[PDB]
Write a protein that binds this ligand. Structure first.
Ligand SMILES: CCCCCCC/C=C/CCCCCC(=O)OC[C@@H](O)CO
Ligand SMILES: CCCCCCC/C=C\CCCCCC(=O)OC[C@H](O)CO
Ligand SMILES: CCCCCCC/C=C\CCCCCC(=O)OC[C@H](O)CO
Ligand SMILES: CCCCCCC/C=C\CCCCCC(=O)OC[C@H](O)CO
Ligand SMILES: CCCCCCC/C=C\CCCCCC(=O)OC[C@H](O)CO
Ligand SMILES: CCCCCCC/C=C\CCCCCC(=O)OC[C@H](O)CO
Ligand SMILES: CCCCCCC/C=C\CCCCCC(=O)OC[C@H](O)CO
Ligand SMILES: CCCCCCC/C=C\CCCCCC(=O)OC[C@H](O)CO
Ligand SMILES: CCCCCCC/C=C\CCCCCC(=O)OC[C@H](O)CO
Ligand SMILES: CCCCCCC/C=C\CCCCCC(=O)OC[C@H](O)CO
Ligand SMILES: CCCCCCC/C=C\CCCCCC(=O)OC[C@H](O)CO
Ligand SMILES: CCCCCCC/C=C\CCCCCC(=O)OC[C@H](O)CO
Ligand SMILES: N[C@@H](Cc1ccccc1)C(=O)O
Ligand code: NA
Length: 463
């Protein structure tokens, strides 16, 4: 009878929970770079714009990385439903910290809170969506598709609302709106959740057995002690600038999948794991380019686009806008394409090519008009139109192609973390002087690697 778009009613709760969480997150993302520019311009924040850009990327990287851990903590320690709640509380506090009358000094506290908060919430709202369905329920795919629509919806309206708020009432109010967004999500989640969510998920579904507590404790302790020792050594030898710490985080984010690889490849469907390397690298490079929209394209939008009549942060709405527009088309395409459907390796290859084209496109206005002037918003619209076209190919089959080849599964989600970590290095190269070369180089490079993957496509599809 009564459903939410054909799904169990409980989906409406999780849909809105995540919509408002994504609202809070992408509302923040859409103005945080500009906020750091502002803090720099007033002499409050003593970093370069390049470093500010690097912060944005490594921020995203750590958020993605944190998300690969929150599932474990919920499933084994605190439960999925408390994970989402307290995750949301931390996210909200993270935005509240930026709304307070502080400047640069509040940035780190905010970043940590949201990293931890999102890590708790993001994987576990997804988990709770699954719990709405029996094993044999054919609606599961549809329900997640609707769930993802809620994600994109929140990502879409946030830059519009928060960005406008920022320009009208300043950054603190804008960040307060992101906080309020999360609060709304928490209200709907908490009271909505009590009614439709299985009480089972108030507790861990796979709680630590007695003999598991100490080994986990030792693991975490060694990791923290090791990380801290590195920071001590870094400060002793004078590698203690912010870019230095960002490099450390870059190294950590990249080393984690490198080590899982070295593990699996060393430890015979070995051949299959080897086949994932080009797919994973393709995913990483795609996510790198896609995640640069909130950094390099946001920079381009503010410095190089004639946007005198609307908030420049609004460009951040194009990414989720195009996902939502493309989605029913690609949904149709993959069912209608019965004969000769492309392989997932081919989708990755073509997906990366489109990402490459999105940057190659952005090289044109600077090459044609020079970089001193300002250009139409349509250049960015076209760029996002292209990279999202790439996303429609890689994103829906990403988890899929990885699975058909638990550690390796997290690596799919890690590819975006690695992509953002790569960005933390790359985006420091972007400026007005390097603009055309930046877009050309990384655009062409991605296309070439898309072509390389096309050549490799047949091998991979057999394994
Ligand atoms: C399902 C079909 C996929 C097709 C969607 C991909 C759309 C790609 C568009 C890229 C071209 C955008 C460049 C437009 C542009 O820069 O014009 C600026 C100039 O006209 C200033 O007025
Ligand atoms: C639980 C795994 C997730 C990884 C957690 C580690 C995250 C640690 C630090 C976040 C790094 C953010 C760097 C940006 C940053 O420091 O900006 C602060 C400004 O420099 C303030 O002066
Ligand atoms: C630090 C200020 C934040 C204060 C948070 C509110 C504290 C009041 C009650 C604690 C709420 C604990 C509920 C945890 C939880 O699992 O919520 C899930 C709901 O049952 C819906 O699934
Ligand atoms: C129960 C948790 C509360 C969740 C709501 C958090 C946000 C609520 C109020 C914050 C709004 C006021 C902060 C913005 C502000 O004061 O601006 C300061 C001046 O405009 C200086 O720029
Ligand atoms: C950075 C996140 C990585 C995972 C964090 C784990 C938290 C640190 C150490 C593990 C402590 C877990 C508490 C054990 C617990 O509460 O349950 C005990 C068992 O359920 C009873 O046998
Ligand atoms: C600040 C990070 C430090 C890194 C190590 C984190 C250690 C944090 C908490 C250790 C929790 C102690 C484990 C024992 C425990 O909680 O189990 C109790 C049982 O559930 C009672 O039967
Ligand atoms: C459960 C609490 C988690 C505590 C945070 C864990 C990660 C802490 C630090 C990661 C390293 C990032 C340091 C960034 C930073 O502020 O350094 C900038 C310095 O001012 C260098 O001039
Ligand atoms: C899953 C295992 C994780 C492995 C982490 C190993 C990280 C060990 C050392 C990282 C070195 C720290 C980087 C510091 C650095 O690059 O300095 C930056 C500049 O040269 C100083 O301005
Ligand atoms: C009416 C379009 C459907 C709703 C779009 C949502 C708004 C999200 C981003 C729009 C901000 C950047 C677009 C600006 C634009 O396209 O203007 C083109 C004109 O030629 C300006 O010279
Ligand atoms: C459903 C139609 C889909 C068409 C999408 C394919 C787009 C093909 C080429 C993109 C054009 C490259 C940028 C446009 C360009 O260079 O012209 C320069 C500006 O028009 C100068 O005013
Ligand atoms: C299907 C739509 C295709 C849209 C993207 C197609 C763009 C293809 C090639 C654009 C590459 C632009 C090169 C610009 C360039 O590097 O010239 C340098 C000039 O000397 C200015 O520094
Ligand atoms: C400017 C001179 C160099 C220009 C290089 C252009 C050649 C680049 C790519 C050739 C792509 C040919 C497509 C054939 C191909 O990839 O086969 C697909 C595989 O058989 C499927 O795995
Ligand atoms: N498309 C990204 C989400 C995103 C939304 C808004 C801006 C940038 C990225 C993933 O999925
Ligand atoms: Na503007």
């Amino acid at each position: 009878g009564k459903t939410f778009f054909g799904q169990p009613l409980g989906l409406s709760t999780l849909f809105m929970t995540e919509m408002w969480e994504r609202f809070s997150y992408y509302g923040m993302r859409a103005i945080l770079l500009y906020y750091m520019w502002f803090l720099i311009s007033t002499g409050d924040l003593h970093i370069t714009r390049a470093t500010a850009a690097s912060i944005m990327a490594i921020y995203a990287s750590m958020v993605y990385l944190s998300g690969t851990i929150g599932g474990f903590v919920a499933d084994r320690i605190i439960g999925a439903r408390p994970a989402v709640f307290w995750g949301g509380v931390l996210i909200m506090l993270g935005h509240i910290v930026l709304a307070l009358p502080f400047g640069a000094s509040a940035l780190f506290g905010s970043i940590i809170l949201i990293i931890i908060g999102t890590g708790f919430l993001k994987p576990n709202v997804s988990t709770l969506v699954g719990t709405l369905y029996d094993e044999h329920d054919r609606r599961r795919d549809a329900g997640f598709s609707i769930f993802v629509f809620g994600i994109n919806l929140g990502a879409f309206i946030a830059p519009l609302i928060v960005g406008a708020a920022q320009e009208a009432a300043g950054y603190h109010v804008a960040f307060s709106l992101a906080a309020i967004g999360m609060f709304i999500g928490l209200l709907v989640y908490y009271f909505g959740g009590k009614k439709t969510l299985d009480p089972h998920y108030l507790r861990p579904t796979d709680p630590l057995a007695p003999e598991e507590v100490k080994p986990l404790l030792v693991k975490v302790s060694l990791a923290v002690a090791g990380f801290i020792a590195i920071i001590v050594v870094m400060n002793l030898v004078g590698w203690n600038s912010l870019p230095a710490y960002i490099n450390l985080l870059t190294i950590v984010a990249i080393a984690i999948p490198v080590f899982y690889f070295a593990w699996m490849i060393s430890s015979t469907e070995h051949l299959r794991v080897v086949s994932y390397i080009p797919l994973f690298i393709a995913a990483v490079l795609f996510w790198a380019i896609e995640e640069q929209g909130s950094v390099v394209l946001a920079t381009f939008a503010a410095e190089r686009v004639d946007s005198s009549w609307f908030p420049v942060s609004w460009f951040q709405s194009l990414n989720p806008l195009f996902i939502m527009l493309y989605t029913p088309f690609f949904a149709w395409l993959w069912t209608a394409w019965k004969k000769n459907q492309p392989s997932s390796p081919t989708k990755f290859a073509v997906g990366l090519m489109f990402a490459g084209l999105s940057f190659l496109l952005m090289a044109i206005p600077g090459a044609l008009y020079g970089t001193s002037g300002k250009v139409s918003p349509l250049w960015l619209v076209g760029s996002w139109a292209l990279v999202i076209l790439g996303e429609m190919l890689i994103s829906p089959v990403g988890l899929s192609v990885t699975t058909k080849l638990s550690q390796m599964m997290s690596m799919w989600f890690l590819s975006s973390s690695v992509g953002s970590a790569l960005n933390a290095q790359l985006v420091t190269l972007y400026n007005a002087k390097s603009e055309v070369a930046y877009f050309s180089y990384f655009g062409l490079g991605s296309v070439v690697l898309g072509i390389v993957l096309v050549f490799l496509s047949k091998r991979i599809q057999g394994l």
